[PDB]
Design a protein around this nucleic acid. Structure first.
Ligand code: MG
Ligand code: ZN
Ligand code: ZN
Lengths: 98, 195, 146, 900, 65
DNA sequence: GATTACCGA
DNA sequence: TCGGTAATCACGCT
């Protein structure tokens, strides 16, 4: 992300500087929106994509002056089972049965 | 810049003097403009050869014309290694030996798939900012950026490109078959497909 | 191999006797220390520098992904350092002057719950070779014939 | 009821496309949308029906049996066709512009008229003649009729043309040629100049090569595939034709109203580009027009072609009916020319039967019985043609008076000829008409001696049968293709369908000296091996212990009564004791079978009058390669006799190998201690000779050969020492362990064995090389990192020294995987080069017959070989290349006459 | 049946004893790659070896041969 | 990606 | 000599 930085639009007033990224815990919202955590056995049994949201805040540069950063989610990102970011990391033997 | 060994050095005088009295300095940049297209381009002559050398000759050193001082030394060093082989001073380096054969895997491949899909999202950001400045003009000053930023994204462009390239295994570089579904019969064979 | 930041390695070798690119001629100066394919710096004695880094790695000061190879041709001399992120390595046990290092007194410790592989590579008895450092080795096969 | 005489090709005139076509297409649209799918353009504008809607060009024509029809496109501007464009350039640089002549004098016209009819037969000779006319018209710029009006030079590659014209004084501007400028030149050629080119005045006019009107293919050649349930995937040809009409449409409006003059020529080239992919997508210099998902479009030239196109994919190789495909599994109880068929496949395949007058009592029962009980029928047929399927709710009203002339389809029975197939179909013989026998399970069964023609084994393979049906193609299958006609092969004369693994090594246990069977075991085995003899097992030849027979005379009941053959076979270990037998036989043609013949050996087979006096049967009487006791029984006693010699031998021989035991345990490889120490003195001094030969090269005692270099002489000498060492140790083990365990019986006679891999199991394993070099790939001067570098020793450069019994140490095992992967690569590499090399030779040579007067002729009547194959004997029935075999004839005919 | 009986034996062309025990004849590409070089014309062919026989005066004399 | 060979200055 | 371009590379089955 820090490769790109500022590029354009054509208007001299608005500019966008790129901030930081956080990755949330794996969750999923259906229609009639409601966000609940996924559990990988549920995502191989009704054809979903076990994924995590990609939040990225941006810096609006107004004439030089930076004043308000807003965090916007850009998309999703698939996530590997029993990695450090999924819900199975460091999780004991009697809990994987659950 | 190349070498100081005299036996290497006398070979360079043969390659210099045979063709140095054809083309002088700073004109082979123009000669690529003779080669890439003809019939007095002038504006296409100089300018396209500046785009060829700075974007095809060794991009791992830089993209600026400042960086040409480093690229002259790097490519000068490889021409050494050809010319003690004409005499015979080392041996051939074999491309099977595991000192030089690395493995790009799921950490490094997935960054290449993120780069293309995120770079195309930035181009989609610019289309929704320039095509919104005029259709509505001016609105509430601090609530401009609360609606210029959040409305000019349309998030689903990113995630489909991530999934569809890996749910088929045909990546936009040209690679085919990089995602093969996990062969699942007999536990010795799920594990052997992970190795 | 996982990866490591490259720039910290440049500072660490420069004070240990690396004579940089600002001064080098180089040839024929008994020289050409590389770093991940890039040529940086020069040192005078080949046998001194390739043994010096290996003694520091088998103490615990520098990080554990560093491996030095030497090339000893009759007319050509290179010192290779590798600090990239995608190599394939292999574990061996260091032997030293005829005796296998860290015999039984540590081996009951692995059998007990005291220490482990995280402790043996810090204590300096296990070594991960590349294909390139493995050129300099000469490996036995059994504890009988050493 | 006519037949096709000849097919004549040409080019469609644009006049002829208008008369063929039924509609003009101007609307780039398919359905638009979800109700009334009728438009004015590319779909059914009276053009072709592919849906179940009956609307066509007034002719009914439901989707079954509706041939599509052709449309046309009035292209507003002329367009160069792609495939002719290479040959339009040959026309343009060989004609005098502005008048239309040929740039030749009348002298060369009158000379080269006569050369057409002289070389008026062969294609290759007249194709070379048309280049020299192209050659002579090229090197002229002054025509004899127009005073040299500054002829320009054409140019090409791929489609854009140019000219080198002068304007001011000596200018060289390249005026790009337009297709309207080209086609005006082509119409000025008179029709009489066309024989001087490669053209024809009634079938190929040159101005018809420029497409003024593009025809539209019908709907039935461009189907509409439905994706899930209601979404229709548009065909690749349909998708490009829609986009052609939208680049035309504007162009009509562009030149009728628009006047910027620049985009027109720019639009002009888009038309060219867009139809060029439509003819052939994979041309050069053209970016492939992709589908908007990532697939290139397979247009007309890829539908016709492309290794799965429509000459090999669908026309000359087709998918068939009435077949099956399952696995195979042995049984040695059916005859040589039968086959098992499962009863599930037998009840889903049918032949037609056509009840005449004498099977009418039979086929009343086959149709009354339903399609459930195994003698049953499926489909009855009246003489009109309305078939009546039997399954539904009654068969009694069809099992009435069956009305002679009908055709009933019933299941396969015991006797109906089927075929069989292996699929890799290498040689002539892997399809052979069998004679169905029906048994309940799910595998095709197959008699063991018929498995060197198919080249099969029984580790889960797949064989496919397919029933022939019509009464001409079925009586052809039975006479010309049954198994017993194919007992010898056309490649070498020797027998092919013969005995295998147990049939050889069982026959050695029957004819050993000391094979004395008792009374119960003789009498039991003559019942099992087919034969029918009365109460004559007689006469209890050696009653010394008890009244029991010998082993020779049980084998001497299968032979005909006047054989006389004598030959020496593989088991001969003492050549001197054969001599004595040979000498006596040759001088006294018929001695008495009792007295002198009990001086016999066990390696000299001698049979007279159907009585084996002396011998021992091994793989010289059967076998996939030459066995001269099945060979001499097909040239003397028909064929139908030799199918019951091989049917009774096989069941007799597997009997004795069953009830005598033929195990092979782990002690068969075992050597006592002092024999093992004999081996180690060979391996030590052969290693000492290697260590000495390294020192000779290293200090300058080279001893060079003149041809090779010092490294290549060294490798030569070293390998010879290593090779010889392994054969010298192979002779020690082979000499020691006797020929009385059941692991060398399998190796001397020959049934899956050698005498190499039984001394590669209690001795060395030799060296371990890779395509002639010894193992050298690895690190910088050392193969594994367990060896000090700069070493050429035996132990250190690929040479194992432990058996497959005494354990391989870890350098030897990793040296052994290197030599093993060289063997597996050369299976899959060599198979693909031999497969393509066969397609070259079949397709070039499949035309040649033999006429009645003995002449091999091609299809044009050119004689290829007089008096077929240096006249005239078939190599399938010749003996070992030669002809009539006087030598055998003399001995055979004399013996019978003299013997009496 | 001419094209099938020449195309069957080339598929069973497995490995042989590539370590032949001769000296004079050298590297003449035995096996399946010879059969393609004789069928396809190929003006070039790799490893030409022309056998030379001698007359009545250079037949038995060792050094004169 | 490798063999050829035909075609082109 | 000498450089250039296409056109070619098992059988069946999921
Ligand atoms: Mg098989
Ligand atoms: Zn119709
Ligand atoms: Zn003229």
């Amino acid at each position: 992300v820090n490769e790109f930085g500022e590029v354009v639009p054509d208007i001299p007033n608005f500019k966008v500087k790129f901030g930081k990224i956080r990755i949330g815990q794996p969750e999923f919202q259906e229609a009639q929106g409601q966000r609940r955590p996924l559990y990988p056995m549920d995502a191989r049994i009704r054809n979903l994509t076990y994924s995590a949201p990609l939040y990225l805040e941006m810096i609006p540069v107004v004439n030089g002056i930076e004043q308000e950063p807003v965090e916007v989610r850009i998309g999703e990102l698939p996530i590997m089972l029993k990695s450090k970011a999924c819900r199975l990391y460091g999780l004991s033997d009697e809990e994987l049965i659950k | 810049a190349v070498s100081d060994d005299p036996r290497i050095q006398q070979v360079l005088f043969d390659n210099l003097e045979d063709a140095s009295d054809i083309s002088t300095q700073e004109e082979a940049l123009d000669y690529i403009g003779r080669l890439a297209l003809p019939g007095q381009p002038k504006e296409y002559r100089l300018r396209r050869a500046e785009h060829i050398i700075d974007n095809n000759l060794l991009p791992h050193m830089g993209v600026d014309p400042e960086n040409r001082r480093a690229k002259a030394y790097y490519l000068g060093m490889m021409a050494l290694k050809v010319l003690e082989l004409s005499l015979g001073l080392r041996g051939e380096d074999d491309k099977d030996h595991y000192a030089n054969k690395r493995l790009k895997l799921a950490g490094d491949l997935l960054k290449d798939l993120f780069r293309v899909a995120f770079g195309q999202l930035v181009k989609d950001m610019q289309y929704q900012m320039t095509k919104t400045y005029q259709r509505k003009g001016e609105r509430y000053t601090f609530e401009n950026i609360q609606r210029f930023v959040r409305n000019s994204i349309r998030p689903d462009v990113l995630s489909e490109r991530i999934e569809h390239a890996l749910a088929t295994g045909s990546w936009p570089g040209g690679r085919t078959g990089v995602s093969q579904l996990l062969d699942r019969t007999n536990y010795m064979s799920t594990l052997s497909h992970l190795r | 191999t996982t990866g490591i930041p490259e720039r910290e390695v440049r500072e660490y070798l420069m004070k240990m006797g690396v004579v940089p690119i600002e001064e080098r001629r180089p040839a024929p100066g008994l020289y050409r220390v590389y770093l991940n394919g890039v040529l940086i710096g020069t040192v005078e004695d080949g046998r001194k520098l390739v043994e010096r880094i290996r003694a520091d790695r088998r103490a615990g000061k520098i990080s554990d992904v560093i491996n030095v190879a030497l090339y000893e041709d009759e007319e050509v001399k290179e010192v290779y350092i590798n600090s990239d992120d995608g190599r394939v390595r292999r574990p061996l046990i260091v032997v030293e002057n005829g005796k296998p290092k860290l015999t039984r007194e540590h081996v009951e410790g692995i059998k007990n719950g005291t220490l482990t592989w995280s402790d043996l590579i810090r204590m300096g008895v296990i070594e991960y070779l590349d294909a390139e450092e493995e050129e300099n080795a000469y490996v036995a096969t059994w504890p009988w014939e050493v | 009821k006519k037949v096709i005489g000849s097919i004549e090709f040409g080019i469609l005139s644009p006049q002829e496309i208008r008369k063929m076509s039924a509609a003009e297409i101007t609307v780039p649209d398919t359905y638009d949308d979800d109700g009334y799918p009728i438009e004015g353009g590319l779909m059914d504008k009276r053009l072709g029906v592919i849906d179940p809607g009956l609307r066509c060009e007034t002719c009914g024509a439901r989707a079954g049996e509706c041939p599509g029809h052709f449309g046309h496109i009035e292209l507003a501007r002329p367009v160069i066709h792609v495939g002719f464009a290479k040959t339009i350039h040959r026309v343009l640089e060989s004609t005098c512009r502005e008048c239309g002549r040929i740039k030749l004098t009348d002298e060369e016209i009158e000379e080269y008229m006569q050369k057409f009819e002289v070389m008026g037969d062969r294609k290759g000779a007249v194709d070379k003649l048309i280049k020299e006319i192209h050659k002579k018209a090229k090197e002229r710029m002054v025509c004899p009729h127009c005073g040299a009006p500054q002829f320009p030079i054409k140019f090409e590659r791929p489609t854009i043309y140019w000219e080198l014209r002068k304007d001011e004084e000596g200018n060289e501007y390249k005026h790009r040629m337009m297709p309207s400028e080209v086609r005006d030149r082509l119409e000025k050629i008179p029709d009489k100049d066309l024989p001087l080119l490669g053209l024809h005045p009634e079938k190929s006019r040159p101005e018809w090569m420029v497409l003024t009107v593009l025809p539209v293919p019908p709907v039935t050649m461009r189907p509409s595939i439905t994706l899930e349930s209601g979404i229709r995937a548009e065909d690749d040809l349909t998708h490009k034709l829609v986009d052609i009409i939208r680049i035309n449409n504007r162009l009509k409006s562009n030149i009728e109203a628009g006047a910027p003059q620049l985009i027109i020529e720019d639009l002009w080239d888009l038309l060219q580009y867009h139809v060029t992919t439509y003819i052939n997508n994979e041309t050069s210099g053209v970016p492939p027009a992709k589908h908007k998902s990532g697939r290139p479009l397979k247009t007309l030239a890829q539908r016709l072609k492309g290794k799965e196109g429509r000459f090999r994919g669908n026309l000359s190789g087709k998918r068939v009916n009435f077949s099956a495909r399952t696995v195979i599994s042995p049984d040695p109880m059916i005859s040589i020319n039968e086959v098992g068929v499962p009863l599930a496949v037998a009840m889903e395949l049918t032949v037609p039967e056509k009840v005449t007058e004498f099977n009418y009592e039979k086929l009343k029962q086959r149709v009354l019985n339903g399609p459930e009980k195994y003698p049953g029928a499926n489909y009855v047929i009246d003489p009109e043609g309305r078939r009546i399927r039997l399954m539904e709710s009654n068969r009694e009203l069809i099992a009435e008076k069956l009305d002679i002339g009908w055709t009933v389809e019933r299941h396969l029975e015991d006797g109906d000829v089927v075929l069989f197939n292996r699929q890799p179909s290498l040689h002539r013989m892997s399809i052979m008409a069998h004679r169905v026998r029906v048994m309940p399970y799910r595998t095709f069964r197959l008699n063991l001696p018929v498995c060197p023609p198919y080249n099969a084994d029984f580790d889960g393979d797949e064989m496919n049968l397919h029933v022939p049906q019509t009464e001409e193609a079925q009586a052809e299958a039975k006479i010309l293709m049954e198994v017993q006609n194919h007992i010898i092969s056309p490649r070498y004369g020797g027998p092919l369908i013969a005995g295998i693994q147990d049939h050889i090594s069982g026959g050695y246990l029957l004819t050993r000296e000391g094979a004395y069977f008792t009374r119960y075991e003789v009498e039991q085995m003559l019942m099992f091996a087919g034969m029918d003899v009365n109460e004559l097992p007689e006469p209890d030849k050696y009653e010394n212990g008890e009244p029991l027979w010998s082993g020779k005379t049980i084998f001497s009941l299968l032979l005909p009564d006047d054989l006389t053959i004598w030959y020496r076979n593989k088991l001969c270990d003492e050549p001197e004791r054969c001599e004595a037998l040979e000498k006596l036989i040759e001088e006294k043609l018929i001695p008495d079978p009792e007295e002198v013949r009990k001086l016999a050996y066990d390696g000299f087979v001698y049979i007279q009058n159907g009585k084996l006096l002396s011998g021992a049967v091994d793989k010289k009487a059967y076998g996939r390669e030459d066995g001269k006791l099945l060979d001499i029984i097909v040239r003397e006693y028909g064929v139908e006799r030799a199918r019951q010699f091989l049917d009774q031998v096989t069941k007799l021989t597997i009997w004795v190998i069953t009830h005598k035991g033929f195990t092979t345990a782990i002690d068969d490889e075992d050597l006592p201690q002092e024999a093992i120490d004999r081996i180690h003195e060979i391996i030590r001094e052969a290693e000492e000779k290697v260590q000495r030969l390294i020192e000779a090269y290293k200090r300058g005692e080279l001893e060079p050969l003149p041809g090779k270099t010092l490294e290549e002489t060294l490798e030569s000498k070293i390998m010879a020492v290593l090779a010889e060492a392994r054969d010298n140790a192979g002779k020690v083990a082979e000499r020691y362990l006797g020929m009385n365990n059941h692991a060398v019986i399998m190796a001397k006679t020959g049934a899956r064995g050698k005498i190499l891999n039984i001394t590669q199991m209690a001795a060395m394993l030799g060296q371990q090389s890779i395509r002639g070099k010894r193992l050298y790939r690895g690190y910088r001067g050392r193969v594994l990192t367990h060896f000090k570098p700069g070493d050429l020793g035996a132990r250190a450069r690929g040479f194992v020294t432990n058996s497959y019994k005494s354990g391989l140490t870890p350098q030897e095992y990793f040296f052994h995987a290197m030599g093993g992967r060289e063997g597996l690569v050369d299976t899959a590499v060599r198979t693909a080069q031999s497969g393509y090399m066969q397609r070259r030779l079949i397709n070039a040579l499949q035309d040649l017959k033999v006429d009645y007067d003995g002449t091999v002729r091609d299809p044009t009547g050119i004689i290829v070989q007089f008096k077929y194959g240096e006249d005239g004997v078939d190599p399938m029935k010749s003996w070992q290349g030669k002809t009539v075999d006087v030598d055998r004839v003399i001995v055979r005919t004399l013996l019978k006459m003299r013997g009496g | 049946v001419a094209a099938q009986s020449i195309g069957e034996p080339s598929t069973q062309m497995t490995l042989n004893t590539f370590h032949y025990a001769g000296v004079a004849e050298i590297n003449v590409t035995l096996g399946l790659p010879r059969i393609i070089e004789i069928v396809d014309a190929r003006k070039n062919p790799s490893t030409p070896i022309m056998t030379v026989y001698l007359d009545e005066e250079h037949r038995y004399d060792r050094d004169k041969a």
